[PDB]
Amino acid sequence: RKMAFPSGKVEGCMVQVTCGTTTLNGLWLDDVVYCPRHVICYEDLLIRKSNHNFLVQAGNVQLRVIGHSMQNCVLKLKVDTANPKTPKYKFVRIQPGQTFSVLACYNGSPSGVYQCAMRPNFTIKGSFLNGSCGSVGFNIDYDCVSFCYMHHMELPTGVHAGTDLEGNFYGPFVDRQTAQAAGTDTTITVNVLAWLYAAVINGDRWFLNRFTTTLNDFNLVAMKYNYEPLTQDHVDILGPLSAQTGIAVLDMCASLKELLQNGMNGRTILGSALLEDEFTPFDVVR
Amino acid sequence: RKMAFPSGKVEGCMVQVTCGTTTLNGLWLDDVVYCPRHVICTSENMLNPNYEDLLIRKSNHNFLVQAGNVQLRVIGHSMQNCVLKLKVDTANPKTPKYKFVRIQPGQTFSVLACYNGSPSGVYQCAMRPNFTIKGSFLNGSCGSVGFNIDYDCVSFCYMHHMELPTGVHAGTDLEGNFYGPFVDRQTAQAAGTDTTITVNVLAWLYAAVINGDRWFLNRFTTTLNDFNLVAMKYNYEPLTQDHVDILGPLSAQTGIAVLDMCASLKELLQNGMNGRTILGSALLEDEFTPFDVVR
């Protein structure tokens, strides 16, 4: 099973932000609420705004905006009181292929939690309800919350686009009503390899063969099947799993090369009949 | 996406229960800690434990309960079926609004997997028709609980007790009664043949229609009897008139009669997916309920 992180620490940070007739989710940390700047639908639009234009609700309580400011594509609303439920936290930016949990929220109220990967085309295959704008993604490492994502937009193909918590978009997207579409996506090779290592650790070994391939030879098969190219960085990352199982990375790649041409052939790997790519090497170790 | 419930209300209830050399998770609600009774078992007891004999020999101070950095004082103990119930000094300040419920096969719920009392991950689940859980249980997840959350009220429906030889998981409701024919004993017990939850696949196909996908529909219908004769050859659960009644609302919203959706499923089982996907899945998904789909 994919598992999401326990969401309790983030749940106590979610609030509702309303400007005019538009309402979405915000993240309340210390005395600042963070939310997508498109709540004010940007240089002009925010000069004309004053504090009384923003209504922040932390459950029953209304919060008083005493200052506002923009950072890239996120609005930073300073409020009268600090969130007593603020966890230890940091803002971080992730890379395609890395995984995180999303707390989907409806008008400030947490609705559900799921585990994601940042796709190579920088979008998120998520299930986002009406009014989930401003929901955040995060990892938890030893009671420290690493916030890595804030949801902004649904793209026509169903997937989702957002920013880091400093307002920098992931991917070539803008927060305007322009026609935009996800680029062609790609399977995350290093995560498939990690998931095959987890299958071996779990006793699934039928796909193991006696052969080894080269980095160059694999990457040609990889692009023929729309797979991210494998780097020496990926190989080194999978090192602990190769040590743990005795299967070298380029021998697992031969295994993967055969899977991409024969299929599981009525067999399964860990119960699936497709190759899972939303588990990172780190995820498998933990 | 399959989503789990936000886990915060349950995280504040998780504690660690230690008895002798055995440690697992407990659930701290008001002034009672619930946990699996095999916490009182040693190695030499697993095969044929006599729980009433083992429990009579314990006193309150044999039970070390820890809520984070704080030891809770046990002031009484009692056994109800296969759950131990430890009365403590202190009512949990973070006790949510809650109830205990017993669920049926096909029902879904979230599991907060914990290790030694600390929550580690959350996932969404279905009770399989053979009364097991296809869980993801780290080495010390005994006593982790499953739940639903409706309008801020938590329904506790499952407590984890053991992994079966086939990799799946068995456990009880919060009254200590096992789901299925399993026992908290290290015997040669095995899960029955697992079947697909038919009513959940059909509800999900209705969810595919509501989301615009219709490629799998066909012009046929079927009788209920004929549908079940076919589906059982694929290890699908028989569909009852109650299931039909339950899908009525989704049949209403989509204009597709239940037995017409059944004919579509019969053909999907005959043909496979032909490399296509239905919602975002290339598999027939059976862990979303009719109730879930309306949400």
Swiss-Prot record, chain B:
Changing C142A: Complete loss of 3C-like proteinase nsp5 cleavage. 3CL-PRO exists as monomer and homodimer. Only the homodimer shows catalytic activity. Interacts with host FBXO22; this interaction promotes the proteasomal degradation of nsp5. Changing P129H: In strain: Omicron/BA.1, Omicron/BA.2, Omicron/BA.2.12.1, Omicron/BA.2.75, Omicron/BA.4, Omicron/BA.5, Omicron/BQ.1.1, Omicron/XBB.1.5, Omicron/EG.5.1. Changing N139A: Does not affect ability to cleave and inactivate human TRMT1. Residues 1-295 form the Peptidase C30 domain. The active site is at H38, C142. Coiled coil: none annotated. Residues 1-295 are cytoplasmic. Cleaves the C-terminus of replicase polyprotein at 11 sites. Recognizes substrates containing the core sequence [ILMVF]-Q-|-[SGACN]. Cleaves and inactivates human TRMT1, preventing tRNA guanine(26)-dimethylation of tRNAs. May cleave human NLRP1 in lung epithelial cells, thereby activating the NLRP1 inflammasome pathway. May cleave human GSDMD, triggering alternative GSDME-mediated epithelial cell death upon activation of the NLRP1 inflammasome, which may enhance the release interleukins 1B, 6, 16 and 18. Also able to bind an ADP-ribose-1''-phosphate (ADRP). Inhibited by pyridone-containing alpha-ketoamides compounds 13a and 13b. In turn, alpha-ketoamide 13b (tert-butyl (1-((S)-1-(((S)-4-(benzylamino)-3,4-dioxo-1-((S)-2-oxopyrrolidin-3-yl)butan-2-yl)amino)-3-cyclopropyl-1-oxopropan-2-yl)-2-oxo-1,2-dihydropyridin-3-yl)carbamate) inhibits SARS-CoV-2 replication in human lung cells. Inhibited ex vivo by michael acceptor inhibitor N3. Inhibited ex vivo by compound 11a and 11b. It is found in: Host cytoplasm; Host Golgi apparatus; Host nucleus. It catalyses: TSAVLQ-|-SGFRK-NH2 and SGVTFQ-|-GKFKK the two peptides corresponding to the two self-cleavage sites of the SARS 3C-like proteinase are the two most reactive peptide substrates. The enzyme exhibits a strong preference for substrates containing Gln at P1 position and Leu at P2 position. There is a cross-link at K2, K87 (Glycyl lysine isopeptide (Lys-Gly) (interchain with G-Cter in ubiquitin)). This is 3C-like proteinase nsp5.
